[PDB]
Write a new protein. Structure first.
Length: 260
């Protein structure tokens, strides 16, 4: 039914579709391949910023530590860090660049600042997420090889972690609002979940893309008009150099939100 709809959609796009939708207002969930591993690509940056915002509770002044960096830190996608190379940036500025632009160098500077890759994995365990695993730095974590467990999570686990962080009480209200705000002001997701949603709902989201035409989006949606919704949509294809399919994420989103 909903299965056959999602199964036909993913078949028509030559790939595998991973979906978790949570409605905290009713508690209900919707899963499709919700316990299968998918390469998370840049959507891990949501967990990264949440880890910094988490620490900003213990250390308030963290959001203002100034980070100097070097030409050697720059990557192909580093719009904000490239611009500020000769001046450096604050931890809060790196978070915003990381979430709202998917700046790869900003992400790497934040990983190092948190205490390395192990620190991100530790943070996920600390909120009860046993599926998340970060194995590489940017941009290597986007290889997305089929059935490769590195840099993966499951849709259900990512949805549960986002729900706890953006809507649950894993963060204090200001941190939570800051995270929602960064998500809400994301500029990279106009053609994904935001497209398939009602046009007056407000959406906050983090995209990801990788090889194998991997196209990801994770979002909190605020209906005007009801209780908030967490939607994870992960999509990966069979051909290594396939074009991304943001339309498929749009189609999956309107198929899912039809059930509400």
């Amino acid at each position: 039914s909903l299965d056959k709809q999602l199964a036909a959609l993913e078949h028509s796009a030559n790939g595998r579709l991973g979906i978790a939708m949570i409605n905290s207002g009713a508690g209900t969930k919707i899963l499709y391949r919700g316990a299968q591993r998918f390469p998370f690509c840049s959507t891990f940056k949501f967990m990264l910023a949440a880890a910094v915002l988490d620490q900003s509770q213990s250390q308030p002044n963290l959001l203002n530590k100034h980070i100097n960096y070097h030409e050697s830190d720059l990557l192909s996608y580093a719009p904000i860090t490239r611009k500020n190379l000769a001046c450096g940036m604050t931890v809060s500025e790196l978070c915003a660049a990381t979430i709202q632009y998917s700046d790869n160098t900003a992400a790497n500077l934040l990983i190092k600042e948190l205490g390395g890759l192990a620190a991100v994995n530790q943070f996920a365990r600390s909120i009860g997420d046993q599926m998340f695993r970060l194995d590489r730095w940017e941009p290597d974590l986007n290889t997305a090889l089929p059935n490769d467990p590195r840099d993966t999570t499951t849709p259900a686990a990512m949805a549960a972690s986002m729900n706890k962080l953006v809507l649950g009480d894993a963060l204090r209200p200001a941190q939570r609002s800051q995270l929602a705000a960064w998500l809400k002001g994301n500029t990279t997701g106009d053609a994904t979940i935001r497209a398939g949603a009602p046009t007056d709902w407000i959406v906050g989201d983090k995209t990801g893309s990788g090889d194998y035409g991997t196209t990801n989006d994770i979002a909190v949606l605020w209906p005007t008009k009801g209780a908030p919704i967490v939607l994870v949509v992960y999509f990966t294809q069979r051909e290594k150099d396939a074009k991304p399919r943001r339309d498929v994420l749009a189609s999956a989103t309107q198929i899912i939100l039809s059930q509400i």
